[PDB]
Amino acid sequence: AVQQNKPTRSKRGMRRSHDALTAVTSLSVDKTSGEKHLRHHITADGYYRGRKVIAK
Amino acid sequence: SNIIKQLEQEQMKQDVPSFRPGDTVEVKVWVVEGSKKRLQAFEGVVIAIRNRGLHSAFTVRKISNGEGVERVFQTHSPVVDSISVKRRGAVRKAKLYYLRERTGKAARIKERLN
Amino acid sequence: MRHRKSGRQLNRNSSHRQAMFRNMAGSLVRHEIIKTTLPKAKELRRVVEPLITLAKTDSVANRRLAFARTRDNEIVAKLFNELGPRFASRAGGYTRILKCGFRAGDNAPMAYIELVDRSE
Amino acid sequence: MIQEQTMLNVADNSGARRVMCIKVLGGSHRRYAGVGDIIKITIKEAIPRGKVKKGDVLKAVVVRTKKGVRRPDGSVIRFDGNACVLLNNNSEQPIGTRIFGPVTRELRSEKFMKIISLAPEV
Amino acid sequence: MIGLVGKKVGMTRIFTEDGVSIPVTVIEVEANRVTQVKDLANDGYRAIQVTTGAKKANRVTKPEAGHFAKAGVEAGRGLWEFRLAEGEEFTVGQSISVELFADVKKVDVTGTSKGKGFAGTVKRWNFRTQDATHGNSLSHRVPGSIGQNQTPGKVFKGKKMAGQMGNERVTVQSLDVVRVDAERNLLLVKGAVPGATGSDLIVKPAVKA
RNA sequence: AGGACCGAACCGACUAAUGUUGAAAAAUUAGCGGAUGACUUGUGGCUGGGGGUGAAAGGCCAAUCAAACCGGGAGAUAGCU
RNA sequence: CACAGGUGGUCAGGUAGAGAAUACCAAGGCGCUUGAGAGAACUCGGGUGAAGGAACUAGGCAAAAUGGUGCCGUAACUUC
RNA sequence: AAUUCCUUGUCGGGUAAGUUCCGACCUGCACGAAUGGCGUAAUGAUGGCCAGGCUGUCUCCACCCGAGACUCAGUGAAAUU
RNA sequence: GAUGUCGGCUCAUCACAUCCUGGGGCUGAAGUAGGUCCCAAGGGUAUGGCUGUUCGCCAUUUAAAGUGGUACGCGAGCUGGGUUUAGAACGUCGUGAGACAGUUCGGUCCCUAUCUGCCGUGGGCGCUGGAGAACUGAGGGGGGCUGCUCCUAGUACGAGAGGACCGGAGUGGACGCAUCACUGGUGUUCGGGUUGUCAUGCCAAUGGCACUGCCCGGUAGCUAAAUGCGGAAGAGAUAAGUGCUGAAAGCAUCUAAGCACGAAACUUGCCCCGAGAUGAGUUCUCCCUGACCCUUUAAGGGUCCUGAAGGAACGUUGAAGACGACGACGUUGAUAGGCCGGGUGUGUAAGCGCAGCGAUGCGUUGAGCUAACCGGUACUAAUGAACCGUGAGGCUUAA
């Protein structure tokens, strides 16, 4: 249920070795607007694959 | 499943008479006793029909000497030789399992004239 | 075990699921563009596209089926009067899902669902 | 599909009306007696002044089941009740003379020929 | 003698005139094309590598493309190997058909069984459930005890517990060959065989027979 | 008529599951007993610790009871840890 | 503790109902202050289940089952 | 026997099989007459036994619907050492 | 300054002083059936009534219902009947308070797993230039049970009664793996019936809510009770045992030399895992074939050009899956949804007409609707890109 011995800094770090975050590999550039966006996601201005399909 | 469909329709019978649940039916089935082969008649009420192409079946109930007897025939089996509709019954359900609970005059089915 | 099953439970019972998709289909037919979660849009496809397909042949029976599945006479009217004639030459694919980032409150993936020719 | 503690009707004129299966004979840990399988039974109801009497322990053969038998073409024959035919312990021949109700061809073995001969059907 | 690679089209039945119904698995075996012959000198053992089916010309990679071009055969959906029984001979590029099983009476079928994922002990090992009532506290399908008291002081290796079930190589031995159909490239085999419909199967002659 | 019967409110607490670092220092759900009476309940008052009260279980007397709590004798005493 | 508990009295709509039970509603008021997915083991709360029917177990624990109105009929025993 | 050690006393009933139960017996270790004896209709969330019905209690578990479990974002304990 | 007790359930594991099955010596072994001893631990090895029971008695089985160890295995796995609290009562003892290895009724079982272990599943690096596959197999795990019937044969044996060895065939029980063609279960995502109530202005028709309201059926999937398969044969070396030849010891002797048999035990043969097998293996294919500077000269550092094979990431996803992982697919496209056709299920929709006073019935009509299924179809969504991965790969000796 509970420890008998305090685990160490070392074992803490080894357990945390798989906690690293994977940064975004590469952002896609819009062909019309040239904005950077996540692939298959629309741009902040509302573009996607060169077309402005967003009301705003 | 083109392949399985071809294999099945290679074996599906052709002269299956059209019948519905609630119809009284006579089924002639082959029986082998030793080397001789003979026909035995099973007459009863069609209480269930399963339509699955080659795997089509149907259940027939008859009261044989006080006790009911249900036989689930496989319509495309060579064991079953001929099927004949003796009486057209009028029901509203695809399956008539309530006839198990029913007995006697309550088990009667009105004849159809459509 | 989920072998060959369809439909997402979406952490709701079936009654809540039916009611939610009824409301959401009404909203999509009304506005022609709605922001929702990605899986919700994936299921709204299956809810809304059959309804528009039903809205092709204009008959009283189809009107009553649509009203049974929608419970909004304005939505039924818009379907049979506008979206039937609009999509009458299209074989399915009446809708479009565009992924649009994540929700701030809970990091849920977000998608716009649109009718393929809304012109707004 | 007959287990221990299950009640069976009697399809013969040996006198017993209802019997209870108390051991499924065969091998060890054997679960079920189907049609044509020998069971050990105790008589729970019997007509007065019959060959057998209440409380007797003897052998029987299952001749009808609700679970039914499967035929080689894949058909199933089910019955509205489970019934058996009483047998002597040390000779395995039927106690009674008449057999009531239908039977199946699963009893087509050299030992149950006497049941098949006097059965009214099959 | 060698086997062949096909796919599980599914299950059906064959009615015979005698009045019996035989449940058959339908295995579609197209032409197995030999891609490589292994010999005792170069490779150390006698085997034939074979491929079957088609594969997209863009999804075949250059390594595999060159490997197929070496044998001068079209690229299939995989590569399998069969060991030669010291008397038989095959050449690279040969096409082995279902007629190989013309005289085979019994076969063994190897395939990947359906995957059940993480399976508990009741399903995976036929463990008997504890009492559903009579005071049982949260311990209905639990495995129960898993060892002795402190004399071993450990769980023994190889113990039956919960984990992955299915999705593993399984062979079924001594299955009757019902029908061998050259024109339609089909083999009907009595009984169920491992895997889902549309999955790769390796059919060999029975080793036990 | 009834310390009558079935049964809500209300008063209770027989069984089971849950929960047991609880939602809760005694509860929740499903069932369960009484339910015009020796009933129940609000407001105020009285009985005080070798004392009270007790259809009596050593029960209850502010989550404390084979002798409450607070302060004192008091740094009791401890051949023991 | 923004805590599934406790807290006296008054008001008492419609339909069905003996009813202040119960179901659905009105007035009125709320969705309970983390959510999004997925649809493993196992746990908790439920639904259904072939054949058998207490063989379970310390024990029919728990579940299943019965259940309303009217008429008929109603045993041993009894302080009537 | 809420009382009997030997004791699962003996015989019978009920079960295929009954240390439990019911009835009779009497060698009452160690009943007994207001610390009441022996019966008793009715009452009982009372102990023991048997039967009809019912059933996932069980043979022997299967499938399904929800809440957790698992992953993602936010906040962020505990015993122990 | 706490190592939870008896019995039960779940899960087991070893020993062999063997219960069954195998091999054999003797037998007061004629045969069947036994007894006893020796070898043998591969597999198998009851269900109920009574009782808290372990035992035990009894009933009925089985090839057998083995004996022991494992904290009299197993409560951070379950239970709590028994023992071992507080209430109460009987017998007995005691003046009493009380007491009893007497009996009786009632009577709270906590723990979110850090480490070892174990069952599964991944990330990293390594394996010496990188990458994609296919393997060998060192090593490891699984599995190994058995009944009954018939033939040989009513033969051998036997006064009869009875009645085989060896060999062959079939058919079962328990156990295990796979699977969904069949028989079914389930199927709150499909269809229908019906109760009460609210609602959509009302009729008609539908919807919500009442355990999916209550029910009747039922697709795909999952599944057992369903149906296929399996335990082997064979080989090698042996145990007890049986021998052949054969001296020591002129004979005799299975043993000293030499030779031949011999069991479910051992090693293989059967299935699965398997090169982190750091002893890191083998085979096939693919790919990269540019210039300059620098100095502690080395398997050194740096700038520019180049960035291949492949991978990864992202997306549509799966009979794959807790998450990773694994498989399919991304316009050179059937990967998912939709759509069309079919199929299956339910069982003759609504509207309308006709008959009837009316409930309702008949016709249009086997109608309407129909999840996961089958065959098709680019309608929607799977993007031009970018990202990681380099630029011929050390020394020594030998041919």
Ligand SMILES: [Mg+2]
């Ligand atoms: Mg439970």
